[PDB]
Design a protein around this ligand. Structure first.
Ligand SMILES: CCCC(=O)N[C@H]1CCOC1=O
Ligand SMILES: CCCC(=O)N[C@H]1CCOC1=O
Ligand SMILES: [Fe+3]
Ligand SMILES: [Fe+3]
Ligand SMILES: [Zn+2]
Ligand SMILES: [Zn+2]
Lengths: 323, 323
């Protein structure tokens, strides 16, 4: 029926063509400490974010899910500015990043007080059903994240609280997997705690190039996201050629109704500007919001993937997920 | 001669009685993500901070050093509001917390880009000599922090940059030591890189109850701070009785000109309010800004410590340190 967006409730039937994982803003925890050299340029960032939105619109995209974690610079009022400007539906998340690159000290301390897991659940419920801060914006998804080869004790608090919140709210869960690990483990743990597989997207699955790993995850009935197209040679990521090979295998094996695609772009980096060193720069040059539509999709079509299959992924699947 | 305070340059001769380590505000990294349930109450926090300042003033304190790390909610304009209100001199810091409870992902990423250590030096220089953000406030100290039993590779970037900045600026360095470890190692590493021991305070030394450890550190010519009076049974801290025993040994051994005292209070916690569980609550009940003056000092006097020795610690030493 309905999903909460940064502009309020929208009928799921009107989401249309959707990108399941992109970031308008993103900062690595600690960016706040580099304020003198890395101040947030409100108006300039908005122009940049708005242009990204317009680029997506030119390729038919009507909706973007931006699951920026709470501890990584999430800014719903900023997202609303983008939406009010461009007409794009933007759905935001409630949740924390994984332990390795997130900001665990705060909830690790509350865990010592013995209230962390309850406090996280309370946060999820407030942001799903009441509003984020004083913005009046509700999250439409819960974001979860795990570490390489482990769901840590810290991370597990969020997993359990997320399952609890989903049972109460029906909210969609979208996950981060680190370096192609823990996909099946995330699904099985969430389902153990009562989560609904039809409301779960296991993310960054494109980080693993073994189709058997994908099938192991898909067996749980969840969605999987190939959501890092364009990211090559960093964060342990495979090449797009490898992503495409893996994707083609799964589509030809009939898994179209469980797969979604995205880039995981960061359109505005929080903190101090930087330039990637030439090694990484070249490999990452295709990491932008138009990449799927100008490079990947054409390659898929040339490989015989039909328009109806593409439509299932970009339109059909997000509609089912949120409805 | 002069030191930068949150209200501009002040003659070091007018610092008077000083507390070397207290926090008006402090949050564990990740507090930002708990904004819905943990919003910062600007006006209420100011009242609380101002009352803390007034309590200190009633015991003769004229100056407080607040070394809240950049990644732990440092807010110089807020400190200025307190100072403009109460007349208290407040000196603030530039620096990041230790790896375990700080926010390393940001500079760990820049380390991958190969610019982190240079960027940290640039930050220190900007905040020491130009101003923090657009506040116009300059830091008067560089804050450094190390982990339990290790100065990590992450932490070392800050240590090296701090030594580099001190050589250029003459800024005072104040450190955090974790669970009574690395005191001698911090001094030796800073001195290796050209830092001036007469401009260094090794902090949280009260966390170690072996006077030989203290002497090992003192041998470098640095200051040491017994700066966590009131903290008992948490963060691996000893009891105040143990702190006093250790302190008495060092004073009776003639180290008065190298020792400073403080509480490390957190007067306003950032994020969601909390209550310590009864075990910790009782042990921590003396953790407040008046504790040194109403409990510890009287105990020292009863142990025969003379007024001139107390004056050396609270007045003489900070004057020498900053001049
Ligand atoms: C800049 C190299 C690519 C990269 O760091 N991607 C990161 C940014 C935010 O989510 C990611 O996966
Ligand atoms: C609340 C228990 C005591 C504690 O956590 N102290 C912390 C707060 C900030 O610097 C510290 O040393
Ligand atoms: Fe991710
Ligand atoms: Fe400390
Ligand atoms: Zn992402
Ligand atoms: Zn402190």
């Amino acid at each position: 029926e309905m999903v909460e967006t940064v502009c309020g409730p929208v009928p799921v039937e009107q989401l249309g063509k959707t990108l399941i994982h992109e970031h308008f803003l993103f900062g690595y925890p600690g960016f706040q400490g580099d304020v003198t050299r890395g101040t947030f340029r409100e108006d300039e960032s908005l122009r940049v974010a708005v242009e990204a939105a317009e680029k997506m619109k030119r390729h038919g995209i009507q909706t973007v899910v931006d699951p920026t974690p709470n501890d990584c610079g999430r800014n719903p009022a900023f997202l609303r500015r983008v939406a009010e400007e461009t007409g794009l539906n933007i759905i935001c998340a409630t949740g924390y990043y994984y332990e390795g690159e997130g900001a665990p000290p705060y909830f690790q301390f509350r865990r010592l007080l013995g209230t962390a897991e309850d406090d996280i659940y309370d946060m999820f419920m407030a942001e799903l059903t009441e509003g984020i801060a004083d913005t009046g914006i509700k999250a439409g998804v819960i974001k979860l994240a795990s570490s390489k080869g482990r769901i840590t004790e810290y991370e597990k608090m969020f997993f359990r609280a997320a399952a609890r919140a989903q049972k109460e709210t029906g909210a969609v869960i979208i996950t981060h997997t680190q370096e192609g690990t823990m996909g099946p483990e995330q699904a099985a743990y969430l389902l153990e705690h009562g989560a609904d597989p039809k409301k779960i997207v296991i993310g960054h699955m494109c980080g693993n190039t073994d189709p058997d790993y994908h099938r192991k995850t898909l067996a749980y009935g969840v969605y999987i996201a190939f959501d890092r197209f364009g990211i090559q040679g960093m964060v342990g990521a495979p090449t797009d050629e490898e992503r495409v090979r893996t994707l083609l295998a799964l589509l030809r094996d009939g898994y179209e109704k469980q797969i979604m695609l995205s880039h995981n772009t960061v359109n505005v980096w929080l903190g101090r500007p930087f330039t990637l060193p030439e090694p990484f720069a070249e490999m990452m040059k295709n990491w932008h919001v138009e990449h799927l539509f100008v490079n990947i999709i054409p390659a898929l079509k040339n490989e015989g993937i039909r328009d109806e299959v593409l439509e299932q992924m970009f339109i059909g699947n997000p509609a089912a997920l949120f409805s």
